[PDB]
């Protein structure tokens, strides 16, 4: 039961090992779970013809970045 109480804790590990474990855990728990929505804004920005008819193309409408 002495070992059952004294199983390996995190503070027994060296600093660099625990830092690596923290990096992986922080990644998975925070960076992956972070969610921001930009798809509609990006698509509408890419679909905008930016001053193209004012621009001297001397031809039919040029394809916009989404096209």
């Amino acid at each position: 039961v002495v070992a059952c109480f004294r199983m390996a804790p995190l503070y027994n590990l060296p600093r660099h090992r625990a830092v690596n474990l923290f990096l992986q855990g922080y990644e998975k728990s925070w960076i992956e779970t972070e969610e921001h929505y930009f798809e509609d804004k990006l698509i509408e920005d890419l679909a905008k013809p930016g001053a193209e008819p004012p621009e001297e193309d001397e031809g039919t409408k040029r394809v916009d970045p989404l096209h």
């Binding site: 804790p9 995190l10 590990l13 474990l21």
Partner: protein, 81 residues
């Protein structure tokens, strides 16, 4: 480096408190030593679960605020904020 040093100091302190108060109840000791007997990876994962409002993580408010400052600084650097 500093975040993990503070967290390790915290968990040594909490482990000392548990090893002082084990005589309260044997069944209490099992559910309080789940943390110390878990593998080191699950250990850091459940020490890093103070995001959102579930708040079952045993992390203190100060150590929580350190990461709830660094994470927003990093998001501002990344362009979200």
């Amino acid at each position: 480096d500093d975040f993990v040093a503070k967290l390790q100091d915290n968990q040594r302190f909490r482990y000392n408190e548990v090893m002082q108060a084990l005589n309260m109840s044997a069944a209490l000791t099992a559910r309080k030593t789940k943390e110390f007997r878990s593998p080191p990876q699950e250990q850091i994962n459940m020490l890093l679960n103070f995001k959102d409002d579930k708040s079952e993580c045993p992390c203190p408010e100060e150590i929580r605020d350190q990461l709830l400052d660094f994470h927003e600084d990093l998001m501002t650097h990344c362009g979200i904020e």
